């Protein structure tokens, strides 16, 4: 009994079901990966190697093949005489393809092929059968949907020693030449003066950041959302989504801890919902995407409203860049490139400024710009909310105020704009208005080191809100 | 010129604003500010509900100053620093205020009037909050506040007819009168949001109860539709008047009962309130137990795991924690549901002391003013006001009756929906074969009740019997 | 069965559950103390309280081992190569402590190693305290009494690790021992140890017993010490203080405990003593409670227990104060005995914490907090970030001149730490600056040259503070 399993998402050892079970019998084991921006795909890489560092201690190695799974698999079954083969399922449209094909090769081979689900919290087409047969539009009906859902069955056990037993990885010398983790120069990629990543990859770092999360929840919030401060923009220690989206960290064992530090600080106190606010967003996007594979676009998207955006390259060039002019979002859109992660709040103001309030540019142009930078956007989680935002499915931020009343000297800005460094607080979210004599000791002049906002933002938020009336 | 100021704090409202119409007559130029301090001495997000009342009550004011083409200012700041600079920068002439009959207010607004005089700022004050000037009711009494709500009737029976509601601000009370507007307004001027201020604002769905005096006119009427055959949290902010919905309510009675005397019952809702504004308005303690002389001395039990239970709504009785939760997530719980979750906090059950229950309703209820607050809590608790014993409420019983399947309990706690009504006030006494049946454990998905109510009623009921006979030979 | 006991905290042979436990039943025993190469003072301190344990350590037929390096690569390693099967801990309730040792805890767990653990560093579980106030921590010290009162009785010391205890345990040594193993030297560290002088407060468990002894028979001659006043200590070191050796755990906090009630039995010839008596036990035990779950205790934002509180970024202002160059001789005086020795008075911490917070300069308590970190030597994480809270106004305004005149009216105090001061009379020694010219000139100390002048104007800056910390208040 030859036992393969598929890593794609799911990159972690605990709460692996798939992973258990094609072990549970078996006298051979190995763990494949097959091979975005440059930070998606350090990310990643990563994530591989904290896998194959874990697998170690195990006795075992990641076998890391280059090559597309239709080509790879077949050979892979005569060569390494494979009798089972198990994934994580994949609930989105295009892997849900991809996985059904593998599944007939393997099938028809003689494989036994394991598909578990632990990507999500639920069993999506369940909902979906509960919903009769459309997945819900709306959270509540999403919620009173979850709330009739049989209670999650507990985390698949971590694979340990003990669960693989006598079950061993086949090895060679040349494992690392032929199986390694490959490196961002090998991709290809420049890397001369990249620094380090603010977020690192692997489901080590992922569990370390749950109970640092956790301890924060209950105790520092009393399980309730907390006021935002200045600081809230900066990546947090205790931030999970990354890990979430690339099954670093299991959102089961997530709810399961979360419930259990709920249950021992509240006295067999069952919580409410809200509680699982995150997770349950992002179950609701995956359920709503699952079954349409256009989910990221507007034409051909039955659930999206046919809106006549403007096409300005110039203009989505000069936002996704950080060149809005208009600092704030500059700073967010730089933080963004450099980093990966952007809080929520500065995604809808980002968001709102390229679609419905500024320059009324496709949600779908700013849905594939995240998808380039941000980490956390899972295909589903992006469309969705990128379409929520520009008002285009499920039923206006100033550019240059908002932030200042949580950030009045600019500290954000100046973080990641240093061109602006040498600007008062007065004028750090609007530039433009600052003295020639201040733009000269900044070193700084508005039209020439940093650009003169790309619209009046007044006349732009009017005009268009006019026109998302006239619209609906 | 005649530059005018009129200070919006309570008195959200362009109708029945006698101080904000005064300031306009002979005036050149008049703006209306709110002062807001951005500051939050806090990390909590509980204080979520009233925070986004107001807001809406302060962008309705702004939408409704822009159909008179003048806007409000939102000012950010305190009063005390704000105040000197808007007078210099402004050229004020004129400051004007509705009354503030509370201790703080009355302190900070006798500052205000000091920095105003000082700079040569002449200063309008009317009251418009309460139906009567409070003061006057104090010396009709003798110099003291009346202590009950019987003795309360009669000094109102004893006043002179209640004033005419003041002139609308319309166009023509505002006739050349002009506002200075700028083109960055919104940006120094504008009405925050609740994500601007700090706020999380994951949690928060469509708001059950809308600020804002366009608001408040429209369910003046509704309320006066259905009485024929609730308005608190517009009477706290001033979206709505106290004396227009007291003429709504004479007029109403004249059309349906045919008679100019109507009985006080018909304001009681009003005069109830007046009655806790004029007790408190000379006394700086009176949201206090220790050293509030008005105040019964109690030793109330000091129990934080049981109120932490009350206030989260984890007591273990589904009517109690309906209520409270309710009142979490909307701001507002009927009168009634007050009655029962406060005499279970305190004289009924937990013998807490009420000054936690009003913490607790500071915090969450829309319409908990200081005044009202305290005074009802006092009232309740039988530390103050007192005219009778009150009714032990029962957790179990007294929703039944009118809500025999519980749909209450089960629109507010979804984990008890599997129960059928025969156990949904008291799931404690299902079976268990039944609590699988509903899918909830006692004692794991749902707490057991927190006390015996039996039993603790019956203490209770015998601390208040032994509190009220030292009372009187107190009293003789 | 190869045990291994980690010494972080509880540096010491008695009262260590831990070690006891792992010694019984175990074939070999080694003592491990994990440093990865916080201020001169405090690296001085701590290689003194191994030194100690490891010659205390020889008298057992054993050594300590002082292995270099972070305990997350040290300890896989050393499973392997010492084919462990035991690792003991005494608990950390600290939140920081409590990540480590849940890493230390999978490691060992994947190596098959069993990890004990005991609380011995707090006089109770500080859980079960937090369980009988219905899962959060008190918030006034006054609940926390009421809840010890009602405590099951606090453990008895264990016993102290004895050769009998020991028995057949050994701890195998080889010739090279001190090469790889020893305790290391400041220079090791880093640290440039020329020009240093003798510690006012030598390290260790030793000294701490003695002490212990010293610190009881002084308690004896004082009346009332059921009520104890910690703010009539000297300004000077005490013989008997005991704050460092409690919070490097040199001294069990059970045993003084213990011998307080017996003394009090002893002197005041009963055994229901109250608990005053524990006050200064009690008040760290308050701050350990109040911290173990809060993760950001030693933080403004995000901490739910903090006033929110608008300070000012002055990183000049701050490094004045921290180096004590102020200008105000008795801060100066009390941030240069600080820097120097790690301890200062209660009522002198009072006194550079307003001055750093709401009284004068107006900077963030977090700041202040730091730098006692690095230098005070009982500064334990909880009771330092705890104080400084409350010393902030974020859970009375020091006069920086008055306050040091009336507790130490000649100045000695002054021209002990600040000797560029020695020549002022008494009349200036306070505000020097107010010295005419020629007094200056007699003194050889010439404000603004040999001295600085006064970094902020009292009067003025403490009246706008008190301010704005009613403006604060007013929410
Ligand atoms: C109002 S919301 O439902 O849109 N939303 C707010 C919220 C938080 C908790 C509850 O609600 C959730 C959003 O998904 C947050 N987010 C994303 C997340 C991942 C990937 C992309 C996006 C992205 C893009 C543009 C705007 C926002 C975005
Ligand atoms: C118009 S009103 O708001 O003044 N009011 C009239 C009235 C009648 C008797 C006392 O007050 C209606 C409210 O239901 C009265 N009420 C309570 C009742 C029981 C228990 C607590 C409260 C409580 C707390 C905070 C604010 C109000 C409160
Ligand atoms: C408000 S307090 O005075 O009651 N207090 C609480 C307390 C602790 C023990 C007994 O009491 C504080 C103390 O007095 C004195 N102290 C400390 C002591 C150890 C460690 C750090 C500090 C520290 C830091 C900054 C200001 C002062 C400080």
């Given at each position: 009994?030859?036992?393969?399993?598929?890593?794609?998402?799911?990159?972690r050892?605990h709460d692996?079901?798939?992973?258990?079970?094609?072990?549970?019998?078996?006298?051979?084991?190995?763990?494949?990966?097959?091979?975005?921006?440059?930070?998606?795909?350090?990310?990643?890489?990563?994530?591989?190697?904290?896998?194959?560092?874990?697998?170690?201690?195990?006795?075992?190695?990641?076998?890391?093949?280059?090559?597309?799974?239709?080509?790879?698999?077949?050979?892979?079954?005569?060569?390494?005489?494979?009798?089972?083969?198990?994934?994580?399922?994949?609930?989105?449209?295009?892997?849900?393809?991809?996985?059904?094909?593998?599944?007939?090769?393997?099938?028809?081979?003689?494989?036994?092929?394991?598909?578990?689900?632990?990507?999500?919290?639920?069993?999506?087409?369940?909902?979906?059968?509960?919903?009769?047969?459309?997945?819900?539009?709306?959270?509540?009906?999403?919620?009173?949907?979850?709330?009739?859902?049989?209670?999650?069955?507990?985390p698949?056990?971590?694979?340990?020693?003990?669960?693989?037993?006598?079950?061993?990885?086949?090895?060679?010398?040349?494992?690392?030449?032929?199986?390694?983790?490959?490196?961002?120069?090998?991709?290809?990629?420049?890397?001369?003066?990249?620094?380090?990543?603010?977020?690192?990859?692997?489901e080590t770092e992922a569990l370390t950041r749950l109970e640092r999360h956790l301890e924060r929840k209950?105790?520092?919030?009393?399980?309730?959302?907390?006021?935002?401060?200045?600081?809230?923009?900066?990546?947090?220690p205790t931030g999970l989504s990354?890990y979430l989206?690339?099954?670093c960290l299991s959102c089961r064992l997530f709810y399961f801890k979360l419930?259990?530090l709920?249950?021992?600080?509240?006295?067999?106190?069952?919580?409410?919902?809200?509680?699982?606010?995150?997770?349950?967003?992002?179950?609701?996007?995956?359920?709503?995407?699952?079954?349409?594979?256009?989910?990221?676009?507007?034409?051909?998207?039955?659930?999206?409203?046919?809106?006549?955006?403007?096409?300005?390259?110039?203009?989505?060039?000069?936002?996704?860049?950080?060149?809005?002019?208009?600092?704030?979002?500059?700073?967010?859109?730089?933080?963004?490139?450099?980093?990966?992660?952007?809080?929520?709040?500065?995604?809808?103001?980002?968001?709102?400024?390229?679609?419905?309030?500024?320059?009324?540019?496709?949600?779908?142009?700013?849905?594939?710009?995240?998808?380039?930078?941000?980490?956390?956007?899972?295909?589903?989680?992006?469309?969705?909310?990128?379409?929520?935002?520009?008002?285009?499915?499920?039923?206006?931020?100033?550019?240059?105020?908002?932030?200042?009343?949580?950030?009045?000297?600019?500290?954000?800005?100046?973080?990641?704009?240093?061109?602006?460094?040498?600007?008062?607080?007065?004028?750090?979210?609007?530039?433009?208005?600052?003295?020639?004599?201040?733009?000269?000791?900044?070193?700084?002049?508005?039209?020439?080191?940093?650009?003169?906002?790309?619209?009046?933002?007044?006349?732009?938020?009017?005009?268009?809100?006019?026109?998302?009336?006239?619209?609906?």
């Amino acid at each position: 009994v030859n036992a393969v399993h598929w890593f794609r998402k799911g990159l972690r050892l605990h709460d692996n079901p798939a992973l258990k079970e094609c072990i549970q019998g078996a006298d051979t084991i190995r763990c494949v990966y097959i091979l975005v921006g440059i930070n998606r795909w350090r990310f990643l890489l990563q994530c591989l190697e904290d896998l194959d560092a874990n697998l170690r201690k195990l006795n075992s190695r990641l076998f890391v093949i280059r090559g597309q799974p239709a080509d790879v698999f077949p050979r892979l079954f005569k060569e390494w005489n494979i009798t089972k083969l198990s994934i994580e399922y994949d609930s989105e449209p295009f892997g849900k393809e991809r996985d059904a094909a593998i599944k007939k090769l393997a099938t028809e081979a003689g494989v036994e092929v394991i598909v578990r689900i632990s990507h999500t919290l639920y069993d999506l087409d369940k909902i979906i059968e509960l919903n009769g047969g459309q997945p819900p539009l709306t959270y509540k009906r999403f919620q009173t949907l979850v709330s009739k859902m049989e209670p999650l069955e507990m985390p698949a056990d971590t694979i340990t020693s003990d669960v693989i037993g006598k079950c061993m990885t086949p090895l060679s010398d040349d494992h690392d030449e032929k199986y390694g983790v490959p490196s961002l120069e090998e991709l290809g990629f420049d890397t001369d003066g990249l620094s380090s990543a603010v977020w690192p990859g692997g489901e080590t770092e992922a569990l370390t950041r749950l109970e640092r999360h956790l301890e924060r929840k209950a105790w520092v919030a009393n399980f309730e959302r907390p006021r935002m401060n200045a600081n809230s923009l900066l990546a947090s220690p205790t931030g999970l989504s990354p890990y979430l989206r690339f099954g670093c960290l299991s959102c089961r064992l997530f709810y399961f801890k979360l419930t259990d530090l709920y249950k021992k600080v509240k006295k067999n106190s069952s919580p409410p919902l809200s509680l699982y606010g995150q997770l349950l967003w992002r179950e609701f996007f995956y359920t709503a995407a699952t079954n349409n594979p256009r989910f990221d676009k507007m034409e051909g998207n039955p659930i999206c409203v046919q809106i006549p955006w403007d096409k300005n390259p110039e203009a989505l060039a000069k936002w996704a860049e950080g060149r809005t002019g208009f600092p704030w979002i500059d700073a967010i859109m730089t933080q963004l490139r450099q980093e990966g992660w952007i809080h929520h709040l500065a995604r809808h103001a980002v968001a709102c400024f390229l679609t419905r309030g500024d320059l009324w540019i496709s949600w779908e142009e700013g849905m594939k710009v995240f998808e380039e930078l941000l980490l956390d956007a899972d295909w589903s989680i992006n469309a969705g909310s990128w379409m929520w935002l520009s008002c285009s499915s499920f039923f206006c931020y100033c550019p240059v105020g908002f932030g200042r009343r949580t950030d009045p000297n600019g500290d954000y800005i100046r973080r990641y704009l240093p061109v602006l460094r040498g600007f008062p607080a007065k004028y750090i979210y609007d530039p433009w208005n600052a003295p020639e004599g201040i733009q000269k000791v900044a070193k700084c002049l508005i039209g020439v080191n940093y650009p003169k906002p790309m619209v009046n933002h007044a006349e732009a938020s009017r005009l268009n809100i006019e026109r998302m009336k006239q619209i609906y």
